[PDB]
Amino acid sequence: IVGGYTCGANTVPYQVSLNSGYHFCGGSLINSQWVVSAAHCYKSGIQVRLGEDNINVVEGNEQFISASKSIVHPSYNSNTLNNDIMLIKLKSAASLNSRVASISLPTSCASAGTQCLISGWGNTKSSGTSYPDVLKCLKAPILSDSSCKSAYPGQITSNMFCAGYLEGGKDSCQGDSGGPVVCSGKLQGIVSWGSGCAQKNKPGVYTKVCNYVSWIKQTIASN
């Protein structure tokens, strides 16, 4: 997250870190057994880390739980990032508590202009590289579809939305991928892509989770 703030330990209690020997992507806990992330974060051998603040220090509230299954969307296209969503099942149910909690899925899609909370352990620099140890947060508005299409002509599908600041300076970034965009208490986006980070006229692009609620529900009903 570039231009964000330190969230505060365990105040984003649905935020997970996906670990394959190191943090490589975020995700969102949607119930005791399941995490939503980005399909472009797929790796074999994922350990889900819940209750994290500093990902390099054991602080006492973590639950580390292996993935048993990952399910990339049937229509994910890695070339265009359309349908950039993945489900990850945990080998055992998380113990839900004040610091490890699920985030609601949406019923309706989010409104343009809504200020959402984006979080992660990704790069904090627009030019160069610095990865934080503690979880970072950013408040960012959903941009209009017209504005998003203008920014990335030919590349925005109905399953994507843009959010952030066209003047630059505030965005998600590498390593935030797969983590949450929460709007009105619902998981409405997944950190997906963007040209660079926090560059002028190049806002973040996010998977539009409200297009996936029927696939998420039938998949979890079946696995």
Residue number, 52 or 176, with CB nearest to Ca ion: 52
Residue number, 131 or 152, with CB nearest to Ca ion: 131
Contact assessment for residue 168 and residue 193, using Cβ atoms and an 8 Å cutoff: no
Q: How far is the CB of 87 from Ca ion (least distance, A)?
A: 24
Q: What is the residue-wise DSSP string for 22-74?
A: SEEEEEEEEETTEEEE-GGG--SS-EEEES-SSTTS--S--EEEEEEEEEE-T
| Closest C-alpha among 35, 39, 40, 38 to residue 14 | 35
| Closest C-alpha among 107, 131, 97 to residue 183 | 107
Residue number, 62 or 171, with CB nearest to Ca ion: 62
| Residues identified as active-site | 40, 84, 177
Joined tokens for residue 202: 């190049």
Q: How far is the CB of 4 from Ca ion (least distance, A)?
A: 19
Pick the stretch among 59-67, 137-145, 155-163, 200-208 that binds Ca ion (CB under 5 A).
Answer: 59-67
Q: How far is the CB of 133 from Ca ion (least distance, A)?
A: 9
Pick the stretch among 16-24, 50-58, 89-97, 181-189 that binds Ca ion (CB under 5 A).
Answer: 50-58
The 3-state DSSP class for residue 21 equals coil
Q: Which H or E element spans position 86?
A: strand 86-90
- The one-letter amino acid at 51: G
Q: How far is the CB of 54 from Ca ion (least distance, A)?
A: 5
Pick the stretch among 44-52, 73-81, 125-133, 201-209 that binds Ca ion (CB under 5 A).
Answer: 44-52
Residue number, 55 or 71, with CB nearest to Ca ion: 55
Give the CA diameter of the chain.
47
* Binding site as annotated, residues for Ca(2+): 52, 54, 57, 62
End-to-end Cα separation, the chain, in angstroms:
33
x-or-dash string of contact with Ca ion, 89-128, rule CB under 5 A: ----------------------------------------
* Binding site as annotated, residues for substrate: 171-172, 174-175, 177
Interacting residues toward Ca ion by CB under 5 A: 52, 54, 59
